[PDB]
Design an enzyme around this catalytic site. Structure first.
Site, PDB file in Angstrom:
ATOM      1  CB  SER A 191       8.709   3.615   5.425  1.00 26.91           C
ATOM      2  OG  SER A 191       8.119   4.328   4.780  1.00 26.91           O
ATOM      3  CE  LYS A 219       6.604   1.856   3.136  1.00 32.08           C
ATOM      4  NZ  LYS A 219       7.599   2.975   2.523  1.00 32.08           N
ATOM      5  CB  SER A 222      11.621   2.525   1.918  1.00 29.88           C
ATOM      6  OG  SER A 222      11.306   2.298   3.611  1.00 29.88           O
ATOM      7  CD  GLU A 275       4.092   5.315   1.946  1.00 25.00           C
ATOM      8  OE1 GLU A 275       4.764   4.371   3.034  1.00 25.00           O
ATOM      9  OE2 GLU A 275       4.229   6.257   1.977  1.00 25.00           O
ATOM     10  CE  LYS A 323      10.475  -0.268   5.732  1.00 20.94           C
ATOM     11  NZ  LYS A 323      11.594   0.769   5.508  1.00 20.94           N
ATOM     12  CB  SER A 324      14.513   3.174   8.787  1.00 22.62           C
ATOM     13  OG  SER A 324      14.697   2.745   7.425  1.00 22.62           O
ATOM     14  N   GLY A 325      11.725   4.286   9.331  1.00 25.74           N
ATOM     15  CA  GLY A 325      11.161   5.323   8.648  1.00 25.74           C
ATOM     16  C   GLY A 325      10.971   6.626   8.798  1.00 25.74           C
ATOM     17  CB  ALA A 326      11.962   8.944   6.452  1.00 25.11           C
TER      18      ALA A 326
END
Ligand code: CA
Lengths: 165, 262
Positions: free
Chosen positions: B45, B48, B105, B141, B208-211
């Site tokens: 993510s 984004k 997210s 996505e 901004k995080s992501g997994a």
């Protein structure tokens, strides 16, 4: 009192008031306003880059409005997921919910969203099912074989799948 | 600072996976610290922010409007869509979709925004045009989070993401109004246990995080003391079999070191 769970989701009924929903879900897990407008959004455990959750919609913004919509992702696990790409391809638009389940497997799906646009009347009810293959469901990560089947008045209107084999 | 590097190495040991790390000075654009700056990692993510940067560029060009309402349906919904699922019957504006994609997210929000700019291929073209010939978005996505080892689809390099983020936030790429809008969205709520958990009172952070699958986790951020950002930090890891808690923990500890030795 614990995060939002599938058991709490099941206990909440259409027609309940905001306070009843909060008392069952645990107010600490829920929020309203902001991006959710007048709906109540309640979080479960962390999952992916967000969380498992339920969102409850109401007939109005009033303190005594009633639940006319229930939605959740990753709170309910399918009982016996047997969906496969082959079975998914046999599902056809116009099938009743019963025909769909006989095709994809009685325990392959959970309810994603259920809404009564004319609450208290059940006419026009929209229902989205999330269905999974044998190892496709994940309550903390990403699905690995899933499908979305949606209906209006109990008849299939469309379907989409991801990573089914 | 060298102590942060020690922490990065410790993270690789704990997690049993590669960690990519970059600290970039926001003003000069000089690299302050780096570890595996040129290895590829899945963006998840974190892409984004680049997506909305591309959307804002079209808005600056007068080819898009923040208030344009986008209507979508059940066919558009994908896994992890808390905001877009709630608004299905009403539609959402471009502005609300970027807010949802960045702050929550929301995966369907990102797909809808991707459609407004022409898809993954056009986001990649946009990056190429601003000097980033490394970062690439290939899928939508939720498939872009697959993180298959050695697969270069939907990946970036720490140094590329950091430099591109700098150009978006400080460059002449976007008008001042758009730069602020992008930052406002990032300043806003799912990354609490990562860098935010070690931030002192008064500090500024836009992140901004992501997994993703295969132990993939990451975060990009612009942060600084006394309410103004002065450094960009990018942290990615992929390949670990450790739990999400463990992954979050390691990133937070690298963050604690970064702040301690600021
Ligand atoms: Ca599967």
């Amino acid at each position: 009192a614990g995060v939002m769970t599938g058991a709490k989701f099941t206990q909440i009924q259409f027609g309940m008031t905001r306070q009843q929903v909060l008392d069952i879900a645990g107010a600490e897990n829920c929020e309203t306003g902001g991006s959710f407008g007048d709906s109540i959004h309640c979080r479960g455990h962390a999952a992916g880059d967000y969380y498992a959750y339920a969102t409850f919609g109401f007939t109005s913004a009033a303190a005594d409005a009633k639940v006319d919509s229930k939605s959740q992702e990753k709170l309910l696990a399918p009982s016996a997921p047997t969906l496969t790409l082959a079975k998914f391809n046999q599902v056809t638009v116009g099938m009743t919910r019963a025909q769909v389940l006989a095709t994809v497997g009685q325990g392959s799906c959970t309810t994603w969203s259920e809404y009564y646009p004319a609450y208290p009347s059940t006419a026009g009810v929209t229902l989205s099912l999330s269905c999974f293959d044998v190892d496709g469901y994940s309550s903390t990560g990403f699905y690995r074989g899933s499908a979305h089947l949606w209906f209006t008045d109990g008849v299939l209107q469309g379907k989409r799948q991801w990573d089914l084999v | 600072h060298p102590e942060t590097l020690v922490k990065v190495k410790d993270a690789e040991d704990q997690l049993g996976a590669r960690v990519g790390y970059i600290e970039l000075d926001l003003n000069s654009g000089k690299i302050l610290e780096s570890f595996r700056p040129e290895e590829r990692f899945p963006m998840m993510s974190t892409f984004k922010v680049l997506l909305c940067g591309a959307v804002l560029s079209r808005i600056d060009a007068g080819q898009e409007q923040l208030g344009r309402r986008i209507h979508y349906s059940q066919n558009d919904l994908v896994e992890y869509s808390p905001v877009t699922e709630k608004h299905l019957t009403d539609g959402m504006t471009v502005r609300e979709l970027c807010s949802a994609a960045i702050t929550m997210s929301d995966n369907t929000a990102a797909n809808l925004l991707l459609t407004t700019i022409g898809g993954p291929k056009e986001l990649t073209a946009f990056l190429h045009n601003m000097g980033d010939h490394v970062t690439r978005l290939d899928r939508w996505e939720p498939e872009l989070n697959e993180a298959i080892p050695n697969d270069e689809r939907d990946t970036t390099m720490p140094v590329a993401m950091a430099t591109t983020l700098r150009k978006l936030l400080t460059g002449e790429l976007l008008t001042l109004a758009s730069r602020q809008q992008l930052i406002d969205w990032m300043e806003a709520k799912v990354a609490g246990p990562l860098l935010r958990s070690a931030l002192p009172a008064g500090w500024f952070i836009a992140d901004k995080s992501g997994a993703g699958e295969r132990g993939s986790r990451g975060i990009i951020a612009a942060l600084g003391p006394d309410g103004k950002p002065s450094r960009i930090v990018v942290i990615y890891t992929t390949g670990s079999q450790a739990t999400m808690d463990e992954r979050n923990r390691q990133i937070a500890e690298i963050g604690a070191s970064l702040i301690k030795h600021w």
